[PDB]
Design an enzyme around this catalytic site. Structure first.
Site, PDB file in Angstrom:
ATOM      1  N   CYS A  66      -6.963 -40.458  -4.143  1.00 53.04           N
ATOM      2  CA  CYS A  66      -5.912 -41.038  -3.316  1.00 53.04           C
ATOM      3  C   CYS A  66      -4.712 -40.134  -3.059  1.00 53.04           C
ATOM      4  O   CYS A  66      -4.092 -39.635  -4.009  1.00 53.04           O
ATOM      5  CB  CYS A  66      -5.455 -42.333  -3.964  1.00 53.04           C
ATOM      6  N   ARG A  69      -0.586 -41.745  -3.625  1.00 52.03           N
ATOM      7  CA  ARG A  69      -0.110 -42.173  -4.945  1.00 52.03           C
ATOM      8  C   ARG A  69       1.397 -42.165  -5.255  1.00 52.03           C
ATOM      9  O   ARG A  69       1.825 -42.666  -6.291  1.00 52.03           O
ATOM     10  CB  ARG A  69      -0.863 -41.417  -6.022  1.00 52.03           C
ATOM     11  N   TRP A 236      -1.825 -48.331   3.598  1.00 53.55           N
ATOM     12  CA  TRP A 236      -1.869 -48.247   5.054  1.00 53.55           C
ATOM     13  C   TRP A 236      -2.773 -47.078   5.365  1.00 53.55           C
ATOM     14  O   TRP A 236      -3.129 -46.322   4.475  1.00 53.55           O
ATOM     15  CB  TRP A 236      -0.477 -48.057   5.651  1.00 53.55           C
ATOM     16  N   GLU A 241      -8.275 -40.693   8.747  1.00 55.21           N
ATOM     17  CA  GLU A 241      -9.374 -41.599   8.360  1.00 55.21           C
ATOM     18  C   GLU A 241     -10.008 -42.274   9.573  1.00 55.21           C
ATOM     19  O   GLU A 241     -11.206 -42.567   9.584  1.00 55.21           O
ATOM     20  CB  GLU A 241      -8.882 -42.691   7.417  1.00 55.21           C
TER      21      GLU A 241
END
Ligand code: HEM
Ligand code: HEM
Lengths: 361, 361
Positions: A66, A69, A236, A241
């Protein structure tokens, strides 16, 4: 025998680490005694609202893959361990979408459902994400990544209209039931963003759109030996992506060649770097679109910058930083971020989120 | 004692594997006897022209970080194990540049110099690449990656004009000498390509240029226990290495912001994805420029496609495929290639090329 041993060991490790961060170091002794008696009496133990709330946060902080973070301590933890029926679960999932979406100003949230007892699940979510598009085949229609789940849903009475953007329904199974139930998502609850470009008007001819909030609903949250197989979470989107993966991969929507067409470039030669130019424009479009409809999104540069600040804060707090380089680097211009130029320790530290076997397939 | 043992073991493994691929399976027995007697008599053994020629090829084929491995069997091996003086080495390096450049139609080549005897080097090349630009500091001038080597060269009598593109000289050390010698590169031997864009005329205002042939000269070639610390090799550039790394990294030439300026876009907001658009245009420029001057170069898509064919051929030959995902994926649009969507085994298989400690620094 051995299950009651692993549980106690992971509990000692978690309570100590958790209470140390919360400033309740003296309460560790009295809490561990209660836990020891609880494991002997029933075979498991129940977390306090404070324990799993911080646990879910720590789990985020330890998520190697991630990039967002930095915002670990602002997680909105929703406690739903009191759900018993399928309607309870449904309403909790509906609530999650509503509160997480927050009319566009997305709020990183997580809904905690009852954990596994004697290894058996209480609530079992089949969806990969609460909001996701369906997929089919003859020629490709919809999202290929959703094909297997789409077939499973169809084997349960659900039927999609077969457009490229059909919303899969919520599908989950309750303890004691052999097959799962499904509920169509209310459209008023789901925010979708049509993709347009700021300078190229012809972009709307592609009729592309995507949903606003990604809510991963198939991962297992492990906190102190307790397995929360059902605990949907969301942050979000990071533009890439959507425009570099979801709409770009040959195995997903495969839109690069069509993007090149509307922006006015040829797809003849690789040396023209048309795929790259298509990617830049599609990604710019994604970012402009989400911002225009008032839905939170972050570009990869800002996101990496935020992650840099996270790395600094972990060093400042005295904690070891863990990360998966292969997932932290963005799929577009990775060398333009600091992440590419350094290495990360891919060690798994608990609490964290794990993959679990899919009930379908 | 232990050095004569490791050598024999690696020799048995190599000769067997090498001769099996060459169809000389029966000659293995007689060759290994000669080698055994050679290790006892002197303390090492000498490869045949056929042995190191294929050895250098096998080494390329096992290079996990290389995307151009499809052309492993076409390597032009130049045998220079007969060099004794510094002039011999110089002329060999000059020859390498000339023959490898081949007036633009680059030929993947490697020059083999004498290997290490009793652990001591015969020829020791200081250059990272035979052709490379210098680097300095007050404010940044030239290529920061070359700073340490530039300082070492200056401590030897060499002085650069302090432009962003000064050609470092060839610098190497012979056995028996305490310090290395240096020779300025003849400009007629070095092909450089000025960077221009096919549609944007203002691009030439950036006055960017790069050299034509990358020749890695600081890696160790290990073949059958024999360490060829000096064995420069070269292939042709993959556009991204220049436009996404060499001219883009903040720690290298850092040209993204200046590229955005000449192409007419703002550097105000990340959401505009200006870095990405700059990268696409700079990379298109690189590819167009090299092709225009008649110098070989390959785009990342064609390169990945070629690598896909390599993966198929290794499966067809029965050989296990090894690769470093983190280096095989291109720094621009990595998800647009097949490499991103699969995993690779990062196991080290000999023969191969290895990193070695830098004599300077
Ligand atoms: C707040 C903004 C967030 C951003 C910008 C962000 C971004 C990202 C990105 C870009 C990835 C890669 C996704 C892909 O390539 O498939 C990722 C993966 C992941 N993130 Fe986040 N994230 C956010 C919040 C969260 C939160 C709320 C949690 C959990 C509490 C979390 C948990 C993880 C995990 C476990 C993965 C790996 C999932 C997988 O393997 O499929 N992230 N994140
Ligand atoms: C023929 C065309 C070639 C292409 C297109 C190609 C391309 C590449 C690329 C893109 C990388 C990454 C470089 C970077 O990111 O710094 C690489 C690394 C590498 N390649 Fe090649 N290569 C070629 C030929 C060769 C040859 C001739 C050999 C050796 C005989 C070779 C050996 C390797 C090795 C060992 C590395 C890693 C070097 C490092 O770690 O700095 N390659 N290659």
């Amino acid at each position: 025998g051995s299950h009651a041993a692993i549980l106690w060991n992971e509990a000692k490790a978690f309570i100590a680490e958790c209470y140390a961060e919360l400033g309740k170091a003296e309460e560790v002794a009295d809490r561990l005694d209660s836990i020891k008696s609880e494991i002997d009496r029933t075979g498991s133990y129940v977390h306090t609202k404070e324990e799993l709330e911080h646990g879910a946060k720590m789990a985020w902080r330890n998520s190697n893959r991630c990039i967002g973070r930095l915002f670990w301590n602002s997680l909105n933890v929703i406690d739903r361990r009191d759900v018993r029926t399928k309607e309870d679960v449904r309403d909790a999932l509906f609530h999650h979408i509503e509160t997480a979406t927050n009319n566009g100003k997305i709020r990183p949230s997580i809904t905690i459902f009852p954990p596994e007892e004697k290894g058996e699940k209480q609530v079992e979510i089949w969806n990969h994400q609460l909001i996701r598009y369906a997929g089919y085949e003859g020629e490709a229609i919809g999202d290929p990544a959703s094909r297997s789940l789409t077939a499973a849903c169809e084997q349960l009475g659900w039927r999609g209209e077969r457009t490229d953007f059909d919303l899969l329904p919520l599908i989950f199974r309750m303890r004691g039931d052999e097959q799962p139930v499904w509920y169509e998502l209310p459209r008023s609850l789901v925010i979708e963003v049509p993709i347009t470009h700021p300078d190229i008007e012809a972009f709307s001819d592609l009729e592309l759109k995507w949903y606003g909030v990604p809510i991963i609903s198939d991962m297992k949250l492990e906190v102190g030996g307790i397995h929360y197989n059902a605990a949907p979470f969301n942050g979000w989107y990071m533009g890439t992506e959507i425009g570099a993966r979801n709409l770009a991969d040959e195995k997903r929507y495969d839109k690069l060649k069509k993007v090149a067409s509307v922006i006015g470039i040829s797809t003849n030669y690789n040396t023209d770097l048309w795929k790259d130019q298509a990617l830049v424009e599609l990604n710019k479009a994604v970012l402009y679109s989400y911002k225009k409809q008032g839905v939170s999104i972050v570009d990869h540069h800002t996101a990496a910058s935020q992650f840099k600040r996270f790395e600094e804060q972990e060093e400042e707090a005295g904690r070891k930083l863990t990360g998966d380089w292969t997932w932290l680097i963005p799929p577009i211009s990775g060398a333009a971020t600091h992440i590419f130029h350094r290495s990360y320790d891919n060690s798994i530290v608990k609490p964290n989120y794990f993959y679990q076997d899919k009930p379908y397939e």
